[PDB]
Amino acid sequence: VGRRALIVLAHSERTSFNYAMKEAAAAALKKKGWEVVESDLYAMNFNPIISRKDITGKLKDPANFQYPAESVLAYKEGHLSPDIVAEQKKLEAADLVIFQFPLQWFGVPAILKGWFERVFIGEFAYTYAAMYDKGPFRSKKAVLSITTGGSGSMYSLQGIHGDMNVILWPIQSGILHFCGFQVLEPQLTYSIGHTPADARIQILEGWKKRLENIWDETPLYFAPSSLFDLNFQAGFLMKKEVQDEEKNKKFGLSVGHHLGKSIPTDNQIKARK
Amino acid sequence: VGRRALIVLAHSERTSFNYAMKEAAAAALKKKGWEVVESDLYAMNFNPIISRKDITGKLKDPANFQYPAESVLAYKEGHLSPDIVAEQKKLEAADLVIFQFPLQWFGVPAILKGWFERVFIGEFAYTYAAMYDKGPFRSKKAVLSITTGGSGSMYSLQGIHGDMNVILWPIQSGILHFCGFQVLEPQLTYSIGHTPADARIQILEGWKKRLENIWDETPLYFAPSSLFDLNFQAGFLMKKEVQDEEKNKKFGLSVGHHLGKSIPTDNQIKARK
Numbered sequence: 275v276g277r278r279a280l281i282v283l284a285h286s287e288r289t290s291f292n293y294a295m296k297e298a299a300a301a302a303l304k305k306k307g308w309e310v311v312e313s314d315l316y317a318m319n320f321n322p323i324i325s326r327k328d329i330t331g332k333l334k335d336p337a338n339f340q341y342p343a344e345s346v347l348a349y350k351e352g353h354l355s356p357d358i359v360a361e362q363k364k365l366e367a368a369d370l371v372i373f374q375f376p377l378q379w380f381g382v383p384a385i386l387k388g389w390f391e392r393v394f395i396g397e398f399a400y401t402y403a404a405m406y407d408k409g410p411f412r413s414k415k416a417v418l419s420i421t422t423g424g425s426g427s428m429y430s431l432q433g434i435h436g437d438m439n440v441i442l443w444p445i446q447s448g449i450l451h452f453c454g455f456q457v458l459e460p461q462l463t464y465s466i467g468h469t470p471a472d473a474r475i476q477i478l479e480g481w482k483k484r485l486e487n488i489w490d491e492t493p494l495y496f497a498p499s500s501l502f503d504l505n506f507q508a509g510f511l512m513k514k515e516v517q518d519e520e521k522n523k524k525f526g527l528s529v530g531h532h533l534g535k536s537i538p539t540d541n542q543i544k545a546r547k
Numbered sequence: 548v549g550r551r552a553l554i555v556l557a558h559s560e561r562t563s564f565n566y567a568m569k570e571a572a573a574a575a576l577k578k579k580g581w582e583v584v585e586s587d588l589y590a591m592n593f594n595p596i597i598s599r600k601d602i603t604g605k606l607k608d609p610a611n612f613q614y615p616a617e618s619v620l621a622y623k624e625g626h627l628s629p630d631i632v633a634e635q636k637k638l639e640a641a642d643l644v645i646f647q648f649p650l651q652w653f654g655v656p657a658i659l660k661g662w663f664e665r666v667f668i669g670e671f672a673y674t675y676a677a678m679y680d681k682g683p684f685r686s687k688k689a690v691l692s693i694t695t696g697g698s699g700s701m702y703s704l705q706g707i708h709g710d711m712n713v714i715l716w717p718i719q720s721g722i723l724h725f726c727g728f729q730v731l732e733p734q735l736t737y738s739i740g741h742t743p744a745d746a747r748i749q750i751l752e753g754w755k756k757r758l759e760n761i762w763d764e765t766p767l768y769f770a771p772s773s774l775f776d777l778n779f780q781a782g783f784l785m786k787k788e789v790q791d792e793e794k795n796k797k798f799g800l801s802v803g804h805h806l807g808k809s810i811p812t813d814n815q816i817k818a819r820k
């Protein structure tokens with residue numbers, strides 16, 4: 275189990291439900307003896323733009339600045355920006371990380387996107403070797419508590435916006451699982467601007483009760499890295515014997531690995547291997 | 548046709564392939580008689596953080612700030628921070644809108660994300676009564692030119708990263724098309740960091756060559772909004788008659804609208820549906 279959890283909030287108003295949602299988690303987690311710490315991005319006057327201003331030390335090659343290589347170099351020799359180091363110290367310590375935020379243009383707010391780009395540095399957050407399954411944060415679990423303006427129906431299989439499982443994919447698979455995270459089931463709060471005060475106070479309570487047993491929760495299913503040949507040579511594709519063994523299955527392995535077939539229902543919203 | 552083009556470049560270095568890729572476009576397009584305007588976010592020192600300071604005038608509800616409402620109102624009444632407006636003036640003028648950027652964390656850089664979040668303001672860029680094909684920019688066409696670190700195999704149907712079409716959905720459909728744009732095929736240039744010098748040159752010439760007949764191109768396929776019940780009591784779901792008519796069809800309509808069925812190949816990468 276865990277004892278320390280980091281809550282990254284990305285909203286500008288202390289009067290919003292998101293803020294409320296954050297304070298709910300803080301109170302709850304603390305109750306069950308957790309140890310909370312938070313990253314209210316807007317509160318930290320956080321900078322989301324990656325740039326050489328991220329490396330305090332001497333760049334290895336100013337003529338042609340290659341951010342990935344320079345920042346990864348920075349992480350080793352110790353030349354990273356002071357705000358990035360501190361955030362990297364929150365993560366490293368944290369067992370559970372809750373990303374509290376409002377859906378903005380089918381994705382995460384710009385400020386949180388930059389928080390990833392600047393904190394999730396190579397070596398630290400991921401290794402081209404130990405990707406996904408073997409990533410650095412593998413002993414950690416992460417969750418997305420989102421809020422939307424559009425209602426749930428809009429995001430169903432017949433909804434005009436499309437399948438929400440498709441929207442959460444790049445985030446939960448591409449950013450979170452890539453670094454080794456076990457991603458729990460997303461806490462989805464649809465049309466929070468069309469919710470009666472009464473129903474809203476229940477969401478705060480619905481969210482807190484969940485947090486009492488959040489760690490023993492069954493995580494989301496991701497195709498294990500063992501089903502692929504992990505080398506530039508092999509282009510990182512599914513082992514041949516798997517490509518064949520999978521050909522007899524009705525559904526794909528997940529939203530990203532649908533393999534031209536039917537996508538397993540709520541692969542990004544519901545746990546069940 | 549289209550004599551006006553806008554190029555959005557989200558890259559800090561003018562020594563990158565993205566900067567070059569942008570110069571390529573500008574060169575090609577001008578030679579064929581197009582008026583080319585640009586938005587070098589990193590050059591412009593663009594502000595990507597959505598805040599109440601995005602509204603010049605006085606708010607309607609200062610103690611309970613809702614970005615959506617206050618920003619729409621400010622749009623309509625004429626008081627959006629002047630920088631956001633300059634950008635909107637650029638968009639209204641453009642027939643073609645090109646987005647040049649490296650793929651970052653399975654998505655769009657935080658700088659471009661925040662660009663969308665601040666310039667694509669209600670009423671101006673999108674209307675809940677004129678979604679997707681009935682959007683404000685329906686007479687415009689958008690294109691994504693994306694450089695990638697990982698090879699295209701990593702993004703095929705059997706690559707560890709999962710299909711590129713699922714990664715593209717949120718953007719092309721969720722942002723671009725939701726506003727009415729006709730989204731043209733993305734110019735995908737994979738593992739740019741592992742590509743021969745000579746090759747890199749052909750990539751720049753293929754871009755240019757393709758831009759000579761970009762307007763005449765048939766756009767990517769998105770389910771028309773005539774298939775949906777654009778009304779609240781119906782939840783914005785697909786019409787019954789249409790729903791039935793589909794239950795006997797092998798393939799789904801698109802990525803997000805896979806309908807539990809099989810998604811046509813390269814729904815987001817190729818056009819012909």
Ligand SMILES: Cc1cc2nc3c(=O)[nH]c(=O)nc-3n(C[C@H](O)[C@H](O)[C@H](O)COP(=O)(O)OP(=O)(O)OC[C@H]3O[C@@H](n4cnc5c(N)ncnc54)[C@H](O)[C@@H]3O)c2cc1C
Pocket residue numbers: 285289290291292293294375376377378379380381421422423424425466467471474475478597613614615664665
């Ligand atoms: C740039 C941008 C892009 C967007 N893109 C999308 C999109 O793609 N898809 C989509 O669906 N939505 C989108 N939205 C809408 C956004 O997701 C919602 O406006 C947001 O999630 C609403 O929640 P909130 O907490 O931010 O704030 P609020 O709108 O304030 O709503 C919270 C509500 O709860 C009330 N409340 C506050 N505190 C408490 C408390 N302690 N207890 C009980 N009630 C409380 C408030 O009074 C209010 O009515 C976008 C918004 C912006 C600005």
Ligand SMILES: Cc1cc2nc3c(=O)[nH]c(=O)nc-3n(C[C@H](O)[C@H](O)[C@H](O)COP(=O)(O)OP(=O)(O)OC[C@H]3O[C@@H](n4cnc5c(N)ncnc54)[C@H](O)[C@@H]3O)c2cc1C
Pocket residue numbers: 324340341342390391392558562563564565566567648649650651652653654694695696697739740744747748751
């Ligand atoms: C925070 C972050 C997150 C990332 N996330 C991802 C991800 O999720 N998925 C992924 O696949 N990749 C990812 N990347 C990698 C990124 O996609 C690549 O680093 C980028 O696309 C490389 O292209 P570039 O144009 O930016 O610059 P450069 O690395 O400079 O490369 C351009 C190359 O072409 C050469 N060149 C430059 N100009 C010219 C010219 N005019 N003619 C010919 N050759 C030229 C250069 O010398 C160089 O070798 C990420 C990078 C960062 C920093």
Ligand SMILES: COC1=CC(=O)c2c(c(COc3ccccc3)c(C)n2C)C1=O
Pocket residue numbers: 379422423424425467615616669673675725
């Ligand atoms: C403040 O709320 C919203 C603000 C938005 O900026 C927004 C919403 C949605 C989604 O949904 C709807 C759709 C129809 C009617 C009402 C809400 C999108 C895509 N955007 C960009 C909101 O709800």
Ligand SMILES: COC1=CC(=O)c2c(c(COc3ccccc3)c(C)n2C)C1=O
Pocket residue numbers: 342343396402403405448452652653695696697698740
């Ligand atoms: C500078 O390049 C890269 C820098 C990244 O920051 C990055 C990449 C990738 C994706 O890709 C690969 C490519 C080859 C082997 C293993 C992983 C991801 C997710 N991130 C966050 C890169 O390629």
